Amino acid sequence: SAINVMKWKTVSTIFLVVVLYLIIGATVFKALEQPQEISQRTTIVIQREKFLRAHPCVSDQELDELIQQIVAAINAGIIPLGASSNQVSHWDLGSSFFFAGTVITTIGFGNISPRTEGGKIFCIIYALLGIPLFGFLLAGVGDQLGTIFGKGIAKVEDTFIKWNVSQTKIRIISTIIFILFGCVLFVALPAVIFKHIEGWSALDAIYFVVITLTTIGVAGGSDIEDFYKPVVWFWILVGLAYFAAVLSMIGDWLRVIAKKTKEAVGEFRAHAAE
Amino acid sequence: KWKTVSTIFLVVVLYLIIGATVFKALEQPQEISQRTTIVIQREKFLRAHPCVSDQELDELIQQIVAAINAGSHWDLGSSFFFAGTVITTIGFGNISPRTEGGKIFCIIYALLGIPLFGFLLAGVGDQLGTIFGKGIAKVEDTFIKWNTKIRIISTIIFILFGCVLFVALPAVIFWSALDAIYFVVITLTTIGFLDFYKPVVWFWILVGLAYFAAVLSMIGDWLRVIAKKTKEAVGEFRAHAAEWTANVTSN
Ligand SMILES: CCCCCCCCCCCCCCCC
Ligand SMILES: CCCCCCCCCCCC
Ligand SMILES: CCCCCCCCCCCC
Numbered sequence: 001s002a003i004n005v006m007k008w009k010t011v012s013t014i015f016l017v018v019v020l021y022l023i024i025g026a027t028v029f030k031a032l033e034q035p036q037e038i039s040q041r042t043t044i045v046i047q048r049e050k051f052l053r054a055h056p057c058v059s060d061q062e063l064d065e066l067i068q069q070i071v072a073a074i075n076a077g078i079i080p081l082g083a084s085s086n087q088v089s090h091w092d093l094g095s096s097f098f099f100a101g102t103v104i105t106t107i108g109f110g111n112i113s114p115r116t117e118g119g120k121i122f123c124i125i126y127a128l129l130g131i132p133l134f135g136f137l138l139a140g141v142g143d144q145l146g147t148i149f150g151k152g153i154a155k156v157e158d159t160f161i162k163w164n165v166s167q168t169k170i171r172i173i174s175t176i177i178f179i180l181f182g183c184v185l186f187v188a189l190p191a192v193i194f195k196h197i198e199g200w201s202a203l204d205a206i207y208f209v210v211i212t213l214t215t216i217g218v219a220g221g222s223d224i225e226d227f228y229k230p231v232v233w234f235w236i237l238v239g240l241a242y243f244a245a246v247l248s249m250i251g252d253w254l255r256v257i258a259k260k261t262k263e264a265v266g267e268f269r270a271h272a273a274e
Numbered sequence: 275k276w277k278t279v280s281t282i283f284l285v286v287v288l289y290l291i292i293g294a295t296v297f298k299a300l301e302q303p304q305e306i307s308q309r310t311t312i313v314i315q316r317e318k319f320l321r322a323h324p325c326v327s328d329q330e331l332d333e334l335i336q337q338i339v340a341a342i343n344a345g346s347h348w349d350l351g352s353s354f355f356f357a358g359t360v361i362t363t364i365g366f367g368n369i370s371p372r373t374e375g376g377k378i379f380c381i382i383y384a385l386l387g388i389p390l391f392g393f394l395l396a397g398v399g400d401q402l403g404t405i406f407g408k409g410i411a412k413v414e415d416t417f418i419k420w421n422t423k424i425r426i427i428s429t430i431i432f433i434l435f436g437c438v439l440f441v442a443l444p445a446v447i448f449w450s451a452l453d454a455i456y457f458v459v460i461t462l463t464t465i466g467f468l469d470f471y472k473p474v475v476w477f478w479i480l481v482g483l484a485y486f487a488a489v490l491s492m493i494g495d496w497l498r499v500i501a502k503k504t505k506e507a508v509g510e511f512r513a514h515a516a517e518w519t520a521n522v523t524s525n
């Protein structure tokens with residue numbers, strides 16, 4: 001346990017980075033959202049105190065219980081209303097295959113989750129089998145797309161061969177054209193599809209794309225204009241293969257910037273200003 | 275040359291088709307039952323209080339739907355819960371940022387935090403893989419001398435011991451028996467539908483994520499086996515079915 005003592009040292013130092021990284025992230029979000037929280041929730045009270053004055057003969061003390069039972073309904077697919085009390089299935093022939101696609105990709109929006117105990121015991125096994133299953137598809141799609149990218153770069157790697165185009169530095173031009181194409185084909189072009197057909201802004205589509213393809217976790221949901229749902233699960237498959245490489249390159253960038261800063265502090269703790 | 279991805283593609287498509295037909299068979303019954311009882315509870319309430327009516331109540335539903343998008347959240351802790359979701363990609367959509375700056379931050383915060391957290395989880399996986407490597411070394415002497423199949427007893431003790439330390443024992447810290455195991459699997463498969471109480475719970479995640487990371491990879495190894503086992507099995511069956519057609523030609 002000589003290198004294993006050197007392992008725990010490296011892990012513990014990373015642990016404190018993630019902790020602080022999460023502390024930085026926390027303080028940033030609460031500085032950006034709790035302003036927008038208080039604003040809406042000072043106006044949710046105005047709408048309560050509006051509607052209790054507007055209709056006093058409703059049960060004040062039991063109205064919140066009506067609100068809670070609507071919120072307790074919200075977790076399941078509910079759009080309860082008198083005009084069009086007749087409704088449509090969130091577990092129809094397709095929306096359950098949307099759901100299955102979420103579970104194996106581990107995207108899992110949680111927009112709809114199974115309520116049956118048979119659906120839970122199936123989903124557990126369906127995930128424990130589907131997640132590794134989908135992995136080998138995604139890996140093959142990554143290799144399939146990595147050789148497609150390997151084909152296109154070979155032609156680009158001959159178009160501008162000048163005198164001693166430095167081998168170490170050509171690899172940077174190649175990774176620039178990767179991010180350039182990739183963040184058009186899997187970020188830009190499909191996101192603009194989610195702006196005319198779903199009704200979003202420019203950010204909210206790119207935000208949607210990153211949240212989904214970073215498998216954090218809807219395109220099938222909002223409806224403006226059945227050619228549209230089968231194709232999106234192909235962009236997901238290849239886009240997930242894309243960010244898988246994108247997140248992995250960023251990981252490689254973080255190794256570099258770890259050792260460069262690790263040796264840098266090494267010299268500054270050596271010299272102490274001459 | 276040989277693609278071999280297309281063949282997998284059709285399995286996943288087929289697997290998703292089976293899974294789909296199973297879920298609607300399990301949920302659309304439990305869907306109709308609820309939503310016929312939701313209409314009864316509404317048609318009770320409109321009759322129980324004529325003070326409220328159709329044209330009022332829909333406005334009450336809309337202002338709850340308008341509330342849904344927001345709902346103290348985002349407090350000093352609930353934003354670091356949120357950040358913990360984004361880097362682990364568990365990402366419970368329980369709370370999501372509404373500000374344009376919170377979205378542009380979250381994008382970059384994920385693009386940087388997900389790989390970052392990966393190296394933590396990787397080291398925790400190696401740290402826990404040698405801890406598991408310690409425990410097996412002593413088990414590999416207590417009865418391995420006494421009377422390829424030993425490797426199964428070891429992986430049985432893995433599932434046995436790990437699905438107590440990371441599923442059963444923690445389960446409450448965080449219902450019923452199912453609802454805890456369902457919770458554990460959903461969370462640690464990253465699907466996600468010295469002082470205060472906060473720090474210790476978040477390390478169960480870290481080590482439990484390292485646990486299912488090995489569990490899911492082990493299952494991947496069994497799928498690779500069962501792929502080759504069935505790959506060669508059809509291999510023989512097409513050999514005999516051809517020689518079967520060949521004999522009726524000669525004889
Ligand atoms: C092994 C070659 C991979 C093919 C993927 C590139 C697609 C190029 C688009 C034009 C050709 C469409 C072929 C459709 C294949 C079902
Ligand atoms: C709730 C259903 C999941 C039970 C998992 C049991 C695992 C048994 C493994 C046997 C492999 C041959
Ligand atoms: C890697 C080169 C593949 C070229 C395939 C052609 C696709 C159509 C491009 C249209 C250019 C006008």
Ligand SMILES: CCCCCCCCCCCC
Nearest residue numbers: 281285288289292504505508
């Ligand atoms: C009912 C079993 C579901 C698994 C999918 C069938 C496995 C065989 C696929 C064909 C492989 C060559």
Ligand SMILES: CCCCCCCC
Nearest residue numbers: 017020021024261265
């Ligand atoms: C979020 C940036 C943190 C930088 C860590 C440097 C500590 C040596």
Ligand SMILES: CCCCCCCC
Nearest residue numbers: 017257258259261386
């Ligand atoms: C904000 C830049 C993150 C890089 C951190 C490096 C940790 C060694």
Ligand SMILES: CCCCCCCC
Nearest residue numbers: 206378381382385386
């Ligand atoms: C809106 C532009 C996002 C910039 C991403 C940078 C990640 C390193």
Ligand SMILES: CCCCCCCC
Nearest residue numbers: 139278498501502505
């Ligand atoms: C690189 C993954 C190997 C998959 C096994 C395929 C052997 C025919």
Ligand SMILES: CCCCCCCC
Nearest residue numbers: 129285497500501504
């Ligand atoms: C050829 C792939 C076989 C997949 C078997 C899956 C069993 C759950």
Ligand SMILES: CCCCC
Nearest residue numbers: 117118119121122
């Ligand atoms: C809930 C029993 C399992 C069905 C596949």
Ligand SMILES: CCCCC
Nearest residue numbers: 175176179253382
């Ligand atoms: C080296 C690329 C940085 C993009 C923000």
Ligand SMILES: [K+]
Nearest residue numbers: 106215363464
């Ligand atoms: K995930």
Ligand SMILES: [K+]
Nearest residue numbers: 107216364465
């Ligand atoms: K997720």
